């Protein structure tokens, strides 16, 4: 049994044409395999807000799921149907995607076509949370927005800057892909150290788009080390000092507005 | 003197402090107090790995070294930094504390705070072993990771499993929330009453909750409702999918060669 898509973000959608594959499979007694497809076809046309994740982070995730496979988008999309069928679902009985799903020259290949091939597939409906469907284009919109704190809904998690390390505070290079960026302003976020270690942070998105981060509570340099944050409120917007005392004054001021809004969430357990 | 933390699972960094904290009474011809704090603000996140260790099992640790007083994290977590240096520390002249330390609503109290309140505060920095500092965190981490051979060069002996209740024998280890070891199969050094010693093959899985099952080799009184600890010794294998049977015998025969190649290295 294979599932066939990008898979962006893994989001709730995502998650549950994986886990109806992993459920024929058991049915069926057979192996799963997942093909991610690099890119969508928007990602080379104007306009593209970013992925949502690298593709090694993708991959990551989706190789929790079962063997996991990428498809160069640039490569498969001059395929014909046929020609993808050949080289990519020879034995496959059982095929899961999502709606809308497109493959091959001038997107000619679809669920129909592989029917026609003795490949039956099964088109997951869209997982819809408060009225709206669930897609990485409806991600990465409340990303540019700011609205990280209505992303879990749709994403399963927390949206999250991660990156190479390049008062005190510590820049991300997040590589060279493609990724959306956050609404520029000031965000409240959970950074995961490399030793294993969670901190608190008030992370900063300025102007291509800067991050860089102050963690709570930490000392030492992270130069070369990779971090994970979790991007969990929008504190505040952009705002420009004419003075640095007027910018200390804001930092300190962040960092307090921080310290509030951590108690909040501790006690918002009991 | 007073230390105060929370130390879960009393390991290296920590010992660091207790030790400090027992060297600057002797010179200031003062007592010894440790304030352990109950719970870290992490604790009650849903993403915790859980305690290395029950709080009981850390005071009868920390005691070791000095009298020992737990501080609730309900009855502290609302004062004002003002309010908890009345409360907790009148009359203390001198505190150890782990660098960033944080008290009070809003995390606002620290170093700071106390020395302008006349207390001197001592902090000790964090211990490094191999490239990275000693935590409860990193330790937490290792134990679900299931690398319990690297655990005794953080946390300054094996990490260890201790609760109640083909024999095995299953372990509850008890209401609080503590952190869970990488499912599978692991060679375990058995800690039962009276002093005795026995090697065990113990296999954590699921049911969600995680069960702590030990087969003890050459042992056969299983203690019913007896206490019992388990130092988790070697990771042996991720768990699997009736040769269960056959597994077992697998797993035992592992077991007693690597418990004979300890012995040979006499």
Redesign the interface.
């Known amino acids: 049994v294979v599932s066939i898509g990008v898979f962006d973000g893994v989001h709730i959608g995502h998650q549950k044409v994986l886990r109806t594959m992993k459920e024929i499979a058991f049915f069926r007694k057979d192996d799963s395999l997942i093909y991610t497809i690099s890119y969508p076809p928007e990602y080379f046309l104007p306009d593209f807000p970013g992925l949502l994740m690298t593709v090694e982070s993708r991959v990551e995730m989706l190789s929790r799921y079962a063997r996991t496979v990428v498809l160069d988008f640039f490569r498969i999309k001059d395929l014909t149907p046929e020609g993808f069928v050949e080289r990519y679902l020879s034995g496959v009985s059982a095929v899961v995607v999502g709606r809308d799903f497109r493959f091959g020259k001038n997107a000619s290949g679809n669920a129909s076509f592989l029917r026609k091939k003795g490949v039956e597939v099964y088109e997951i409906e869209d997982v819809v949370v408060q009225g709206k469907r669930v897609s990485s284009s409806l991600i990465r919109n409340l990303v540019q927005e700011g609205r990280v704190e209505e992303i879990p809904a749709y994403l399963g998690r927390y949206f999250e800057i991660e990156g190479i390390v390049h008062f005190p505070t510590a820049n991300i290079d997040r590589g060279n892909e493609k990724l959306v960026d956050l609404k520029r302003g000031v965000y409240l976020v959970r950074v995961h150290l ?5 901190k608190f942070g008030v992370m900063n998105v300025g102007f291509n788009v800067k991050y860089e981060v102050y963690i709570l ?4 340099d992270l130069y070369g080390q990779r971090l994970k944050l979790e991007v969990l409120k929008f504190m505040r917007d952009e705002k420009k000092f004419d003075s640095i005392e007027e910018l200390k004054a804001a930092i300190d001021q962040d960092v ?1 507005s921080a ?2 809004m ?2 909040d ?3 918002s ?2």
């Open positions: 490399p030793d294993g270690k969670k509570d930490f000392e030492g307090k310290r509030n951590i108690d969430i501790i006690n357990k009991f």
